[PDB]
Amino acid sequence: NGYTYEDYKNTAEWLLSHTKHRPQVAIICGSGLGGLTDKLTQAQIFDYSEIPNFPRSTVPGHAGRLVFGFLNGRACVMMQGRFHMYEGYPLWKVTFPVRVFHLLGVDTLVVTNAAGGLNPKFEVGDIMLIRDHINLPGFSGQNPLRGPNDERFGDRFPAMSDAYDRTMRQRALSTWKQMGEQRELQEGTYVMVAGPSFETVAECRVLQKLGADAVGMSTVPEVIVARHCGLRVFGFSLITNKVIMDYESLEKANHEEVLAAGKQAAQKLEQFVSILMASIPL
Amino acid sequence: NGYTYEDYKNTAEWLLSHTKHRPQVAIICGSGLGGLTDKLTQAQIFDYSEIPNFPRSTVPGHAGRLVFGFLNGRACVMMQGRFHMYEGYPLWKVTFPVRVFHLLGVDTLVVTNAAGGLNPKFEVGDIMLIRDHINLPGFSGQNPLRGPNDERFGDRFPAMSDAYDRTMRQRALSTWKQMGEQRELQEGTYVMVAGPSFETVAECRVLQKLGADAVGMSTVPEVIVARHCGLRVFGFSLITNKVIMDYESLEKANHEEVLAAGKQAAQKLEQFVSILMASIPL
Amino acid sequence: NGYTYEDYKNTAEWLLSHTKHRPQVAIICGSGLGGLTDKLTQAQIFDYSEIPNFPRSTVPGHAGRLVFGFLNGRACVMMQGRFHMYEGYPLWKVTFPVRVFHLLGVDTLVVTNAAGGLNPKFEVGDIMLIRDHINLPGFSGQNPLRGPNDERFGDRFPAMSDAYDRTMRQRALSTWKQMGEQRELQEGTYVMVAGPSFETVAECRVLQKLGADAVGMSTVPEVIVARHCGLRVFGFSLITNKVIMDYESLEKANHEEVLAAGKQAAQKLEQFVSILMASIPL
Ligand SMILES: O=c1[nH]cnc2c(C[N@@H+]3C[C@H](CO)[C@@H](O)C3)c[nH]c12
Ligand SMILES: O=c1[nH]cnc2c(C[N@@H+]3C[C@H](CO)[C@@H](O)C3)c[nH]c12
Ligand SMILES: O=c1[nH]cnc2c(C[N@@H+]3C[C@H](CO)[C@@H](O)C3)c[nH]c12
Numbered sequence: 001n002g003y004t005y006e007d008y009k010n011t012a013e014w015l016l017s018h019t020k021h022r023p024q025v026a027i028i029c030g031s032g033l034g035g036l037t038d039k040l041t042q043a044q045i046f047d048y049s050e051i052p053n054f055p056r057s058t059v060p061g062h063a064g065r066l067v068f069g070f071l072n073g074r075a076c077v078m079m080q081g082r083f084h085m086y087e088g089y090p091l092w093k094v095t096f097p098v099r100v101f102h103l104l105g106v107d108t109l110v111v112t113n114a115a116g117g118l119n120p121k122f123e124v125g126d127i128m129l130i131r132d133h134i135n136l137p138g139f140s141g142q143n144p145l146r147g148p149n150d151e152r153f154g155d156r157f158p159a160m161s162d163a164y165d166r167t168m169r170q171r172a173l174s175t176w177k178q179m180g181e182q183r184e185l186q187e188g189t190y191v192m193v194a195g196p197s198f199e200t201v202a203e204c205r206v207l208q209k210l211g212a213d214a215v216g217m218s219t220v221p222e223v224i225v226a227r228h229c230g231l232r233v234f235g236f237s238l239i240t241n242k243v244i245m246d247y248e249s250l251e252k253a254n255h256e257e258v259l260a261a262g263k264q265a266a267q268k269l270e271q272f273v274s275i276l277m278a279s280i281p282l
Numbered sequence: 283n284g285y286t287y288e289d290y291k292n293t294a295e296w297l298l299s300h301t302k303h304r305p306q307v308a309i310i311c312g313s314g315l316g317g318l319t320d321k322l323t324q325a326q327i328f329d330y331s332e333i334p335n336f337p338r339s340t341v342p343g344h345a346g347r348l349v350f351g352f353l354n355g356r357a358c359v360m361m362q363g364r365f366h367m368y369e370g371y372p373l374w375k376v377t378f379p380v381r382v383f384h385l386l387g388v389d390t391l392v393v394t395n396a397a398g399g400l401n402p403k404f405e406v407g408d409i410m411l412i413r414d415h416i417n418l419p420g421f422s423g424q425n426p427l428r429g430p431n432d433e434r435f436g437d438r439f440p441a442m443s444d445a446y447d448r449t450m451r452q453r454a455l456s457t458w459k460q461m462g463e464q465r466e467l468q469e470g471t472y473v474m475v476a477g478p479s480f481e482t483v484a485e486c487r488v489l490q491k492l493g494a495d496a497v498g499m500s501t502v503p504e505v506i507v508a509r510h511c512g513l514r515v516f517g518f519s520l521i522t523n524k525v526i527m528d529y530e531s532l533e534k535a536n537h538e539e540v541l542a543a544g545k546q547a548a549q550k551l552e553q554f555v556s557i558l559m560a561s562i563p564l
Numbered sequence: 565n566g567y568t569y570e571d572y573k574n575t576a577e578w579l580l581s582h583t584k585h586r587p588q589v590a591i592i593c594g595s596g597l598g599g600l601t602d603k604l605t606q607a608q609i610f611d612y613s614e615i616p617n618f619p620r621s622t623v624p625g626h627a628g629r630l631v632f633g634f635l636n637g638r639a640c641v642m643m644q645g646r647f648h649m650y651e652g653y654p655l656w657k658v659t660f661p662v663r664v665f666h667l668l669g670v671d672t673l674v675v676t677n678a679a680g681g682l683n684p685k686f687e688v689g690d691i692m693l694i695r696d697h698i699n700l701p702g703f704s705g706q707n708p709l710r711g712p713n714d715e716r717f718g719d720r721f722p723a724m725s726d727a728y729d730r731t732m733r734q735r736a737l738s739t740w741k742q743m744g745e746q747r748e749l750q751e752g753t754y755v756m757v758a759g760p761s762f763e764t765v766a767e768c769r770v771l772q773k774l775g776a777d778a779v780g781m782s783t784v785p786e787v788i789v790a791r792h793c794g795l796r797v798f799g800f801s802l803i804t805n806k807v808i809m810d811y812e813s814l815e816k817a818n819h820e821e822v823l824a825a826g827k828q829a830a831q832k833l834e835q836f837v838s839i840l841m842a843s844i845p846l
Contacts, residue, residue: 160764189766202471210766252443370565421704422705424705478722488698
């Protein structure tokens, strides 16, 4: 890890003194879910590039910013654009924001992402609540906590079986009932793979066999660091596509489709997250 | 990745100006399959050591060369000796040749390798056509595309479900029928593991459960980079041994046997590849 | 690998000339199993910090020492405190001791560790004999042998199917019978995961499906290097806890419990190892 405790502190103190905003809930917007930033009131923007020690974006779209403000009663801080392992960032960089959020006073982390559907019941447009995750990179050594542990953040061996807040998931099923939607709020296990290339058929079959319902290349690391911090964690995935499971199919997974699905099912998530804010304690 | 686009370009331009040969098909010879180089006509050799930016071989046999020429009508370029992750090379080095081939004008990549049999039907000597692969290293982060993506080569999120050319596999089943062989042309999923040590029984059982038919420690990376390039991909494995699946057995997997199997079933592959060249378009 | 053959040699020669002790059996004490060092007679201690080229401990407890001496007839060398991948050490550092032991004249390696139970029959306190292992980090590239192979230590492609000495496991079942214990000596497959965070429910389910009986974040690397050396290998795990397999449970895996289980079932292992020494040849 190239960051010392002081680096986290310095980044927090800098932000704290550059905004009157004191966020309680940190929200990490997934792919095509950055619209959430529009609903924040008294929205103050910060380009990642101007924040000390922040991993400087590469060239996806060169748009990486932190937006503080209020979302339906809650003082938030939103990450529009997240860092992925496939871009070359080590996990201690990818999850650097999470630790900053913690020293800023945040106690809740909401993570969202786009994902391929492994569970055959899922349909494009669906919203899967994350009850658990399978951290494939972590089994091999790619765990954001690798390296010496700093007592100030958490313990050497944090548990993850209770990573996704039971309460918040129940309250989300409610908020969705109040939404009065045709499709029900899906729920399942999110498996993380590094990517960036998409899975082959044999691979989708493996991920299915392992018991995963959705697959993506992010989130798990932020969640582990969050939990290591003491943060309350709640999150969901937007099934942007059904991963190919047979060799007869003549369709391929593509960034085009994923962005399109994020485009249409857009505002639906935005409502759900905004309304969900009320369900979050303080 | 320690290579810039220019490095690939410089290596291509260098080769291009050191040979009148303009290959269309790149062939990566697996272990004990390097004999294929003998059939090339007007064969021009290049030691890896003399090619700019090429990963310099270590000490397997210190023999690593690029052979240009013609193989049954097709202008080829053969890699006799390939780079493996277990030797310490990062994947961006292992797959460096593939990108060079592309800038040289190659549009087809034929990859061959030796492998352990996971599918109990397979027998030593068998030839498994690769219909799909399971990229275990990739799930964890060891994917040759990790790091910033260069638009000039391909897209950020290339698909792999269609990685192994459907057409070429069918035409291979034909060419094998014309071969009039006792044993049929096997076909299945190749699982890549880093090695270098051989699998334990519990591990073979895992690889079996995942649905893999053959296991090796190469290929998948070259295939991913190839596909990322736009290359047509076709390849096969020579089952050099049946991986141990029970604890009663008193036999161990060894490099001795693998080389021996490659030695006898040698020329059989050489015919198949040479004849297969005619099946490859232009 | 940052170590040259000479570094191993220099460390061996240094130890050899700083102790009259010439160990035959190397013992790696797992978590809360370091008590084994108490039974050594004519016990000579060496802090890792004073041994040339030894990975210098971080801050777990700052206690990392090598203890030479005799354990029930056998000239031993015990590692009290082992190096783990999750601390940031690359595997060539983690397993550095093993190669030193070999050049010191050791021909047997006994490895012990604490582990979570995956097999539902296992109970806290149980002692699982290791018949085989699943090396998840290794499939991805995290194998201690990665990098050039030094002929002087072993071969490029060592086998692991016969890694855990058949004979010694049988003799251990005997020694346990002579122990006259209520519970029988368990036996099974140890799966290694990098950690440091504990598994989630979905993950435990995966490890179960793969056929693992116990899970930990060590051992496999030392075993692979040992086997690569020619060392006889025998080892066991102390089931310090039953990993959570259902979402209804309200208990979490914690370092507290693991240490406690190691605390009570302590001396039981110490007897077993001490008595087992007699079963080890020479
Ligand atoms: O089929 C899939 N496999 C793996 N990840 C995704 C995702 C998630 N994100 C979306 C994004 C690519 O379009 C990349 O960062 C991965 C959507 N569909 C799939
Ligand atoms: O049983 C096996 N397990 C994993 N790989 C192989 C291979 C493939 N190559 C062959 C070569 C070792 O002999 C090394 O580079 C791996 C053949 N048999 C097996
Ligand atoms: O449930 C478990 N999962 C993974 N490893 C362990 C272990 C083994 N060691 C014990 C130690 C943590 O308490 C750390 O180095 C891992 C005990 N229980 C479990």
